[PDB]
Amino acid sequence: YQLTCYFTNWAQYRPGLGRFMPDDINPCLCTHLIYAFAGMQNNEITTIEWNDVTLYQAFNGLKNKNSQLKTLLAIGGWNFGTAPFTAMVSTPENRQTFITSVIKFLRQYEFDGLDFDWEYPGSRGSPPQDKHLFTVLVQEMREAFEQEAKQINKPRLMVTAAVAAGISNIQSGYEIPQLSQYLDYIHVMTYDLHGSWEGYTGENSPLYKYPTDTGSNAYLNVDYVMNYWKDNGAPAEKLIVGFPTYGHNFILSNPSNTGIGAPTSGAGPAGPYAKESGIWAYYEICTFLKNGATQGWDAPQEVPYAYQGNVWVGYDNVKSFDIKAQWLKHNKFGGAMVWAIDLDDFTGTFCNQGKFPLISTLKKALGLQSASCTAPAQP
């Protein structure tokens, strides 16, 4: 199995124990590491943070300690939008320029591949033609990677993509059978399945539907989404299940109603570390529990939740991660991916469950080897 962990280049800005740098990553924890995010200028891949080059060097340096660890650079993200991707894929000449820039960039900084994080072709501003042009882009990238490998006599660079979990976004975004022939791995973003934007409580990454889920709401679970991709042309082994190391919080409209689907009046507060509205990192949730929050188990969906007064959070813990990991194995998917490594309790000081409690759970459940992390009696 694969265990793919996203590192985010903005985690450096968090105060105190929240600060997360490339050197805070245990090199023997994950099989793949992905750096989020790279940008684009004039159809060419670029850095986004002032210190990205320094972070790239530390990030890819981790491979010195693990001979099987592979690294990828993710281009795009939420804030990036769709416009630059639309313009870049619009002509073969722009695509070649991008592809050439990517090969050069990845080889210069010592990455093993590229992860596409276009959110999304065919939606969120992106016109209908982008669905097919994404396939074409990925086809050409794979081909150029294949050719470059023979030119410089090294293993091929990898090409992967993070993809939508929403059914309508999936249907307007991807030509699944053809796209799946070119991508090495498909990172399905099976999280943010519910949030305060809906106006009622719901789980971030529920494994199964809630008993009252009808119609399109019945699609908002890991089980349905992963099976949709499988049934429509993506090889099980290439499909990687999305695991969130954070949850979404809510303000309860009525503190006496604390169930799934209880009315909410807005996003819960951003925490002092991640400072993201309606979101708490797992370690931020542990603080919430330490302050006496009532723990609930959403049994039909196999995920926890917690509440204190008018604040409610839906999230994932060790139990839910293990349950979904076991599920993943029963259904023969390629492994798990994690958003994000810097959101787990990496210090081990918040949750009293060891360092990286959530990602350690996945390493154990997926039976990852550690022989490649060996270190000799040489100084």
Curated annotation (Swiss-Prot):
Domain GH18: 1-369
EC number: 3.2.1.14
Cysteines joined through disulfide linkages: C5-C30, C28-C373, C286-C351
GO MF terms, alphabetically ordered: chitin binding; chitinase activity; endochitinase activity; kinase binding
GO CC terms of this entry: cytoplasm; extracellular region; extracellular space
Effect of D117A: Loss of chitinase activity. No effect on protection against apoptosis or on AKT1 activation
Tissue expression profile of the protein: Detected in lung epithelial cells from asthma patients (at protein level). Highly expressed in stomach. Detected at lower levels in lung.
UniProt GO BP: apoptotic process; chitin catabolic process; chitin metabolic process; immune system process; polysaccharide catabolic process; polysaccharide digestion; positive regulation of chemokine production; production of molecular mediator involved in inflammatory response
Induction per the UniProt record: Up-regulated in lung epithelial cells from asthma patients.
Keyword entries, A-Z: Apoptosis, Carbohydrate metabolism, Chitin degradation, Chitin-binding, Cytoplasm, Disulfide bond, Glycosidase, Hydrolase, Immunity, Inflammatory response, Polysaccharide degradation, Secreted, Signal
Record-listed chitin binding positions: E49, W50, G76, G77, W78, N79, Y120, M189, T190, Y191, D192, W339
Active-site residues (renumbered): E119 (proton donor)
Catalytic activity: Random endo-hydrolysis of N-acetyl-beta-D-glucosaminide (1->4)-beta-linkages in chitin and chitodextrins
Function statement: Degrades chitin and chitotriose. May participate in the defense against nematodes, fungi and other pathogens. Plays a role in T-helper cell type 2 (Th2) immune response. Contributes to the response to IL-13 and inflammation in response to IL-13. Stimulates chemokine production by pulmonary epithelial cells. Protects lung epithelial cells against apoptosis and promotes phosphorylation of AKT1. Its function in the inflammatory response and in protecting cells against apoptosis is inhibited by allosamidin, suggesting that the function of this protein depends on carbohydrate binding.
Subunit structure: Interacts with EGFR.
Family (UniProt): Belongs to the glycosyl hydrolase 18 family. Chitinase class II subfamily.
Name the UniProt record assigns to this protein: Acidic mammalian chitinase
Organism: Homo sapiens
Gene this protein is translated from: CHIA
